[PDB]
Amino acid sequence: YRARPPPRRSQEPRWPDPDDPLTPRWQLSPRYAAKQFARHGAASGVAAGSLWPSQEQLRELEAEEREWYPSLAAMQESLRVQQLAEE
Amino acid sequence: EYPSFVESVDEYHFVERLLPPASIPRPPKHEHYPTPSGWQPPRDPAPSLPYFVRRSRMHNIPVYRDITHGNRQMTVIRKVEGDIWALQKDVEDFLSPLLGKTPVTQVNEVTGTLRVKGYFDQQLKAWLLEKGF
Amino acid sequence: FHVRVTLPPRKVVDRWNEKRAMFGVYDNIGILGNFEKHPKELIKGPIWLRGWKGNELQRCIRKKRMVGNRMFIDDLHNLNKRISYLYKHFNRHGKYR
Numbered sequence: 636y637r638a639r640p641p642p643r644r645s646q647e648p649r650w651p652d653p654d655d656p657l658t659p660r661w662q663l664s665p666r667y668a669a670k671q672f673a674r675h676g677a678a679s680g681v682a683a684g685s686l687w688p689s690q691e692q693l694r695e696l697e698a699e700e701r702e703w704y705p706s707l708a709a710m711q712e713s714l715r716v717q718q719l720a721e722e
Numbered sequence: 723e724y725p726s727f728v729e730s731v732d733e734y735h736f737v738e739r740l741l742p743p744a745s746i747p748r749p750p751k752h753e754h755y756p757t758p759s760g761w762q763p764p765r766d767p768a769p770s771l772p773y774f775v776r777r778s779r780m781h782n783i784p785v786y787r788d789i790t791h792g793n794r795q796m797t798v799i800r801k802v803e804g805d806i807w808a809l810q811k812d813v814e815d816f817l818s819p820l821l822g823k824t825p826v827t828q829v830n831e832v833t834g835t836l837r838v839k840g841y842f843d844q845q846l847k848a849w850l851l852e853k854g855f
Numbered sequence: 856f857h858v859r860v861t862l863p864p865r866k867v868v869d870r871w872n873e874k875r876a877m878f879g880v881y882d883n884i885g886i887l888g889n890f891e892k893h894p895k896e897l898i899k900g901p902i903w904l905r906g907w908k909g910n911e912l913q914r915c916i917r918k919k920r921m922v923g924n925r926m927f928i929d930d931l932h933n934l935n936k937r938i939s940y941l942y943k944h945f946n947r948h949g950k951y952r
Contacts, residue, residue: 641888642884684725687725
């Protein structure tokens with residue numbers, strides 16, 4: 636006999652039908668797109684601009700970053716209060 | 723309203739530094755042996771003994787310690803190609819004057835393995851270095 | 856305990872038919888194949904069982920998580936009862952506590 640054609644893995648960028656009801660949601664995610672680019676991205680045809688945070692997303696990350704994450708100077712100034720109190 | 727991006731191959735060599743090796747490198751030759759941490763390479767020829775001990779893929783002598791039932795202490799010599807009885811003669815004869823009695827042994831011809839009762843690890847390394855295996 | 860009085864037709868098996876002769880042909884696919892497709896992918900079976908294992912309780916709870924909402928009313932119900940029974944039998948009974 637001849638054996639079957641050996642099982643291979645196609646490296647062409649793969650896009651599941653967006654409007655298809657049966658499609659799993661983890662394949663329609665905005666993340667799936669970015670990973671698609673990370674594997675090929677020229678052949679994938681993902682717009683490179685999309686791989687960075689938008690204006691809104693950037694204002695919101697900015698907000699969180701300055702809110703929960705102080706400045707080095709500020710934290711030193713914060714330590715000085717405690718040490719003075721202890722002494 | 724996408725941001726503008728710039729493409730370049732110049733800074734890519736840094737990313738070459740981050741790729742892990744999938745194969746272990748051969749140890750760089752030095753002027754002096756043994757090295758500071760004590761690693762000593764095998765000789766240029768091989769000895770004429772009718773057995774040979776393959777050093778493990780990190781290139782260390784394949785002698786280990788083992789504990790069964792929490793009180794049983796053993797030493798396993800591994801990766802032996804040849805007459806293993808030849809090896810057991812020598813190991814036993816070498817260990818005997820230290821122990822006062824002939825040490826208990828299990829020879830495995832199918833595995834190519836030797837088991838010795840007790841911890842002789844330290845003293846066996848020194849021995850398989852002398853013989854050059 | 857009455858036993859057959861007539862001999863059956865001798866069963867001729869050609870072990871050289873396509874299926875038996877090709878058996879286990881692509882098994883080494885990962886190793887000999889510069890690992891891309893892992894041998895799990897060779898598994899043709901029920902959609903929640905592929906390349907995965909477990910005792911009866913884990914099987915049942917797994918099937919209920921994966922294919923659950925595609926199930927018929929009756930097999931779904933029996934699946935719930937079975938999960939319950941196995942649950943309290945594994946947790947609350949045995950010799951070895």
